[PDB]
Design a protein around this ligand. Structure first.
Ligand SMILES: CC(C)(COP(=O)(O)OP(=O)(O)OC[C@H]1O[C@@H](n2cnc3c(N)ncnc32)[C@H](O)[C@@H]1OP(=O)(O)O)[C@@H](O)C(=O)NCCC(=O)NCCS
Ligand SMILES: Nc1ncnc2c1ncn2[C@@H]1O[C@H](COP(=O)([O-])OC(=O)C[NH3+])[C@@H](O)[C@H]1O
Ligand SMILES: [Zn+2]
Ligand SMILES: [Zn+2]
Lengths: 296, 276
């Protein structure tokens, strides 16, 4: 079986859906401590925003998400019809028929990544000041990838630091964080390597997109062996978007050029699972240095 | 609207009524409220934390679909072949509608934090004497757009849940109807208790004639006990009730009541919320 499976009893209860779990108090306390630790490394002048698990469908469309991962997107739908119509749908359900045929899309999707909503927000403020803007964002995200592996969820929490400004601003930020992220994983007693990577772009063209992204080194990941050293798990990523979002949303840097952006993302559930996989379910037995930095 | 002005310090627009980004000020208060509620948690209470989505089939069995079908948010996705999905996005490129290729997932956005806990308890067999107590939280969803700050589409719910005999649930209800009030009192909130059976603690937010329900008690009879086959220690279908706290409503209440400057909040309140 999967090396992570034995962890399930202590960390999760089933909710009748693969990748969707109830968190025990033990698991939760570790997520919160990881969150606090990440917060303690926040750079000065970084604005903290917290987003709900949903976001505007129009914004997600405009962001170009359907062009990259249409297969992962969770859209919100409801019964928007007339009372007669809605009653009809319910009656089918009562009669073992299919109520869902009356669903129609809402103006909302479940967020695929924590940073998305922040770009329209930064743009509404007009031109960027010299040195750009830094944001601290989090959200419960959704990706439509059902799986029984504990490191592959459908609903998971994502925490990010986001840099918006000049190519220089973003590169400095990304470099800084690739170093600081490795220092953090060390403090946590986790084994890792950092490597160039690519997003799981969809379809045939998606294979050309990934090769290109990898060669341009626009995405690094911090990888931790969970089920094996041969196929480690990405628990953080460092993403350079170049000018995509700046152009998309009309954000201009202090030079009046289309702003560049990048983000450093922490997979909270993946990090928590890595911690338990590495140090086990008995917190009293965790290494003293680890217990100390987490303030246990 | 009395609350509208609060937005300046609490929220940023996300392109959708009732869906706002939350500032550090606002979130710090939501967290402290969460902490305060935790401090009143009863012994022997199992704390579970639910994600924003849950089983569609569980939701169907809960009866929610019969009661508030218009408020449900169902999860839908593109579940077809690669060619079908590409076409959908191409239609979108050509000024058409890509959503016609959507089909329901096995999931919905949770309408109430406690719903998923009932099948969990049922799965463990007969309840012990005295029943079970749970502490649940979830980001919940209600498909009802509004510009009012106390009527969101996505909001945090916190709940203590009692599963047991009618005696268990009644003692639990009585206890919590009292604690809920004591809590609102310590928060320096002005409220009245009404019986909409269901108990509700309503706080004047827009007006005194139309106060907002910020905490409630729901008694479900043996509805979930019967649906999931939860059996009490005497072999009968279990009863359930829950005390529910609208975390985002409570936070808006606090800012409305005491203002957006935490330094000028009363010392009692700063004290109980670990601010002073
Ligand atoms: C007036 C009519 C449209 C509905 O009235 P209402 O605003 O729902 O008033 P209610 O008495 O139903 O409020 C209670 C419900 O509001 C919901 N709620 C809580 N916080 C909310 C918020 N921030 N935004 C929208 N709804 C919220 C909860 O689901 C709650 O249900 P519960 O008390 O059984 O747990
Ligand atoms: N299915 C899943 N289950 C659990 N965690 C996941 C996940 N998908 C992503 N994550 C976590 O979120 C992080 C960010 O994912 P990503 O790099 O694919 O998205 C982004 O581009 C963030 N802007 C990953 O490094 C991982 O730690
Ligand atoms: Zn990001
Ligand atoms: Zn409930």
């Amino acid at each position: 079986a999967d090396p992570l499976d034995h962890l399930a009893d202590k960390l999760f209860h089933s909710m009748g859906s693969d990748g969707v779990y109830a968190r025990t108090a033990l698991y939760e306390s570790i997520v919160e401590r990881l969150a606090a630790l990440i917060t303690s490394h926040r750079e000065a002048g970084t604005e903290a925003l917290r987003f709900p698990p949903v976001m505007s469908r129009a914004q997600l469309e405009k962001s170009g998400y359907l062009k990259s991962f249409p297969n992962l997107l969770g859209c919100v739908c409801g019964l928007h019809g007339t009372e007669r119509e809605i009653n009809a749908a319910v009656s089918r359900f009562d009669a073992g028929g299919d109520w869902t045929t009356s669903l129609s899309p809402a103006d909302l999707v479940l967020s695929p990544a924590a940073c998305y909503p922040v770009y329209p927000i930064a743009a509404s403020r007009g031109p960027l000041p010299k040195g750009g803007l830094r944001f601290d964002v989090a959200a419960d995200c959704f990706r439509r990838e059902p799986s029984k592996h504990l490191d592959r969820l459908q609903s998971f929490r994502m925490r990010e630091y986001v840099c918006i400004g000049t190519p220089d601003d973003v590169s400095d930020f990304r470099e800084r964080w690739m170093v600081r992220a490795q220092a953090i994983a060390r403090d946590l007693g986790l084994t890792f390597r950092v490597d160039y990577a690519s997003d799981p772009f969809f379809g045939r063209v998606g294979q050309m997109k990934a090769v290109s992204q990898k060669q341009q080194q626009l995405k690094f990941e911090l990888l931790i062996p969970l089920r094996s050293e041969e196929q480690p798990t990405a628990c953080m990523s460092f993403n350079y978007h170049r000018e995509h979002f700046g152009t998309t949303w009309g954000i201009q840097d202090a030079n009046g050029e289309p702003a560049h952006t990048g983000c450093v993302a922490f997979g909270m559930d993946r990090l928590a699972v890595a911690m338990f996989h590495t140090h086990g379910t008995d917190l009293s037995a965790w290494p003293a240095k680890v217990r100390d930095i987490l303030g246990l």
